[PDB]
């Protein structure tokens, strides 16, 4: 089955084989399709198909609701009708069959998504938000006009929201192990802390296992242990912006006596049921208004250290120990001991079924 959309005038119709285009880091699945035109009533004699990657986002200074500013991050256009002699491209397996079914009035088009591009990520809107989704979302636009610079008509264009998604790698990586050693003032004996997750790659809804090992040799007593999972998102529109948001926190009242060890296993699970009110949280790309899980981590192109546009989502696990206060310095010093454990949170590669849109609709 393929997806088709028709213009309000009915003269233009475009066919897409899918809506999610998997990103393999080094290569991206091509965006192929077929455009059906009727030149008898079409006097413009030119048909243009445009793929656009835009960072749609609201405005706080403007009091108008719903209005957003559109900033294109990647724009590519290919003209289908009339067939361009220079734009000769091979036909995919699905593309050739669509031409045969429709007839001789259907012409193909094919785009190549370049690498080092953002994935479809939609920030969670607030309760008072009534406009379109905010974030990065691709779009396939088809229209007929005399020239590119000519004004576009609402009745003479079609648009489909497509997605660029990534899935969990087949090969697991090294186990994330991080340790710290804090040295105090009263005594030279250190306060050791170790933490290690079970595996690097976790799935959406799969529990996260944290192993905590505390080797206390100082004179102070640890009061509370805080374990949290935080979502790190990087936005690069005009300047790089870093912000954090905890999606799952669990506090334990475990107390470690001086000159004693400690060992425990903690289980955490990030989910959207308790994070509904956290405005600004990053979620996977929505089509229109569907419910989507937390944004999956983005697989960066090795250690290229490039400034990727759009939104880059990453996760970490923080283990924090609360140390008792008092003594000489009182409540002025900061004796808390913390350590961070990065991990990857994605989806397994689906076998046949692509991601769907609210399968049991209300």
């Amino acid at each position: 089955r393929v997806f088709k959309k028709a213009s309000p005038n009915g003269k233009l119709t475009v066919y897409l084989g899918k809506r999610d285009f998997v990103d393999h880091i080094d290569l991206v699945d091509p965006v192929d399709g077929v455009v059906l035109v009727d030149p008898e009533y079409l006097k413009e004699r030119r048909v243009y198909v445009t793929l656009t990657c835009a960072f749609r986002y609201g405005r706080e200074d403007l009091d108008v609701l719903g209005l957003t500013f559109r900033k294109d991050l990647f724009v590519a256009n290919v003209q289908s009708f009339p067939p361009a002699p220079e734009d000769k491209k091979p036909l995919t397996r699905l593309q050739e069959r669509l031409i045969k079914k429709l007839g001789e009035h259907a012409y193909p088009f094919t785009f190549e998504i370049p690498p080092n591009l953002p994935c479809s990520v939609t920030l969670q809107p607030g309760p008072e938000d009534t406009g379109k989704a905010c974030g990065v979302d691709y779009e396939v636009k088809a229209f007929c006009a005399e020239n590119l610079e000519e004004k576009i008509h609402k009745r003479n264009s079609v648009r489909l929201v497509i997605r660029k998604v990534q899935y969990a790698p087949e090969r697991p990586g090294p186990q994330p192990t991080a340790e710290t050693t804090r040295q105090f003032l009263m005594s030279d004996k250190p306060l050791h802390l170790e933490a290690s997750l079970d595996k690097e790659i976790y799935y959406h809804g799969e529990p996260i296992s944290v192993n905590v090992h505390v080797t206390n040799n100082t004179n102070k007593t640890v009061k509370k242990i805080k374990i949290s999972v935080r979502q790190y998102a990087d936005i690069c529109l005009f300047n790089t912006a870093q912000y954090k948001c905890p999606v799952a926190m669990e506090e334990a009242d475990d107390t470690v006596a001086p000159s004693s060890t400690f060992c425990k296993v903690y289980t955490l699970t990030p989910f959207l049921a308790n994070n509904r009110e956290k405005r600004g949280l990053a979620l996977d790309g929505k089509l229109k208004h569907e419910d989507t899980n937390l944004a999956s981590s983005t697989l960066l192109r090795e250690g290229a250290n490039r400034e990727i546009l759009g939104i880059i989502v990453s996760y970490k696990v923080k283990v924090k120990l609360v140390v008792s206060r008092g003594g000489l310095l009182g409540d002025l010093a900061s004796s808390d001991v913390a350590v961070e454990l990065p991990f990857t949170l994605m989806h397994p590669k689906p076998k046949e079924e692509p991601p769907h849109r609210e399968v049991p609709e209300s």
Partner: antibody
Framework: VQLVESGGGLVQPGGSLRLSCAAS????????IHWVRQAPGKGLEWVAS????????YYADSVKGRFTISADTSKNTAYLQMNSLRAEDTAVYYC?????????????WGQGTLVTVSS | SDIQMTQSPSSLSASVGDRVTITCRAS??????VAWYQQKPGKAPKLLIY???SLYSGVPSRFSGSRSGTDFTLTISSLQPEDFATYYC?????????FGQGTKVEIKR
């Protein structure tokens, strides 16, 4: 991996019952747990559903307002609280599980529990 | 909205090695969100097909499904002796999830 439920039995009409489905082998955040009842000699019917990831619960129109479904994530168990049971509610109740990402049918089913409502 | 899934025939009989076809009709378009189950008497239903064409893992390849508009068909190539049970039709596109009436398959004498 196995779904086992307990709590069925004979209850007078207008009473209450508690069905507990102790899911083993998977969690409740990555799986959506459904309850399906089958009347003696009749076809299957869907009564309740819970999605712990999005915090959404659904009920059939016949059992709306009388049946309450909830999940205890601590021990991976889902409960079905029934109130004001009637004679037509006698059936065999099955506990079913479906993938949260994404729905692909009720692949895992419970062994079945029998609920009889008679005066 | 509610969807009434009319499953025909109500019951049929066939011999071993016969090709058996079962028709499931939906009152409204449900895309390709249809699943098939097999429930032997006394046991829990077993999932066979999901998305109306994808065979579930561990199911013998003799089972197959097809879609044509709103008509969904479950076809068994060779009627093995262990295929004699009741088959139900399901749709999971709209809440509530509605099942079919069920079809009984028995030996022929």
């Amino acid at each position: 991996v196995q779904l086992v439920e307990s709590g069925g039995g004979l209850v007078q009409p207008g009473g209450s019952l508690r069905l507990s489905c102790a899911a083993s082998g998977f969690n409740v955040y990555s799986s959506s747990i459904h309850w399906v009842r089958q009347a003696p000699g009749k076809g299957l019917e869907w009564v309740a559903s819970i999605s712990s990831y999005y915090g959404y619960t659904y009920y059939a129109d016949s059992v709306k307002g009388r049946f309450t479904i909830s999940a205890d994530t601590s021990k991976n168990t889902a409960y079905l609280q029934m109130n004001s049971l009637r004679a037509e509610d006698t059936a065999v109740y099955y506990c079913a599980r479906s993938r949260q990402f994404w729905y692909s049918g009720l692949d895992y089913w419970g062994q079945g529990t029998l609920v009889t409502v008679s005066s | 909205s509610d969807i009434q899934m009319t499953q025909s025939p109500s019951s049929l009989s066939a011999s071993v090695g016969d090709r058996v076809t079962i028709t499931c009709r939906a009152s409204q378009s449900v895309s390709s969100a249809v699943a098939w189950y097999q429930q032997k008497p006394g046991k829990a239903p077993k999932l066979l097909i999901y998305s109306a064409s994808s065979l579930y893992s561990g199911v013998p390849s003799r089972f197959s499904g097809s879609r044509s508009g709103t008509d969904f068909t479950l076809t068994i190539s060779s009627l093995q002796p262990e295929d004699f049970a009741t088959y139900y039709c399901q749709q999971y596109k709209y809440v509530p999830v509605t099942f079919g009436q069920g079809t009984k398959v028995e030996i022929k004498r």
